[PDB]
Amino acid sequence: IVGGYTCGANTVPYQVSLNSGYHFCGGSLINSQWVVSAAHCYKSGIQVRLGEDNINVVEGNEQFISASKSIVHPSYNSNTLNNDIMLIKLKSAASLNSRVASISLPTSCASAGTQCLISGWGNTKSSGTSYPDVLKCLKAPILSDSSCKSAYPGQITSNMFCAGYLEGGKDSCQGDSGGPVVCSGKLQGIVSWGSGCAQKNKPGVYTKVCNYVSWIKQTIASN
Numbered sequence: 001i002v003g004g005y006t007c008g009a010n011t012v013p014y015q016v017s018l019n020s021g022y023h024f025c026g027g028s029l030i031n032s033q034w035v036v037s038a039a040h041c042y043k044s045g046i047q048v049r050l051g052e053d054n055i056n057v058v059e060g061n062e063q064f065i066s067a068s069k070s071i072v073h074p075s076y077n078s079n080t081l082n083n084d085i086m087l088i089k090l091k092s093a094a095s096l097n098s099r100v101a102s103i104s105l106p107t108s109c110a111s112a113g114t115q116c117l118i119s120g121w122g123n124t125k126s127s128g129t130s131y132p133d134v135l136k137c138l139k140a141p142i143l144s145d146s147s148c149k150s151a152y153p154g155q156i157t158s159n160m161f162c163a164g165y166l167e168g169g170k171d172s173c174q175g176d177s178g179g180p181v182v183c184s185g186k187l188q189g190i191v192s193w194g195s196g197c198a199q200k201n202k203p204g205v206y207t208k209v210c211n212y213v214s215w216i217k218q219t220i221a222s223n
């Protein structure tokens, strides 16, 4: 997260860290045995870390559970990142409490102007890599479809939305991928891509979760 602030330990209880010997993507806990992340974060050997704040120190509240399966959306396209969503089932259910809790899926899509909270342990520099030890937060508004499409002509599908600042300086970045975009207490986006990080006129692009709620429910129900 570039231009964001320290969230404060466990203030984002649905945030998870996907770890393969190091933190590589974020995710959101939606029930005690399932997490939603981005299909481009897929790999084998994933351990899900819940109740995390400082990813390099065990401080208490952490729960490390291995992933039993990862279900990448069948129509995920790695070249356009259309349908960039993935579900991870946990080997055992997490213990939910106030530090580890699930987030609700939306009932309707959000409108431009809605303010949302984006969080993650991704890069904090737009020019160079600087990965933090504690969780960072950023409040960003969803942009209108014309501004999103004028920013990425021909690269936005109806399963994506832009959120951020066209003036630059505040944005999600590499390492934040798979993580949550929460608006009005509902999971509305998944950090997906952008051109560079916090660059002027190049806002972040997020997977539009309201378009996948029936898919998530049917898939969890059959697995």
Ligand SMILES: Cc1cc(Br)c([O-])c(-c2cc3cc(C(N)=[NH2+])ccc3[nH]2)c1
Binding pocket: 040, 041, 171, 172, 173, 174, 175, 176, 177, 191, 192, 193, 194, 195, 196, 197, 198, 203, 204, 205
């Ligand atoms: C090289 C590389 C590898 C992975 Br995997 C990423 O997720 C990314 C990535 C870039 C990137 C940029 C943004 C943004 N809002 N500007 C958000 C997520 C991102 N993820 C970059």
Ligand SMILES: [Ca+2]
Binding pocket: 052, 053, 054, 055, 056, 057, 058, 059, 060, 062
């Ligand atoms: Ca820790």
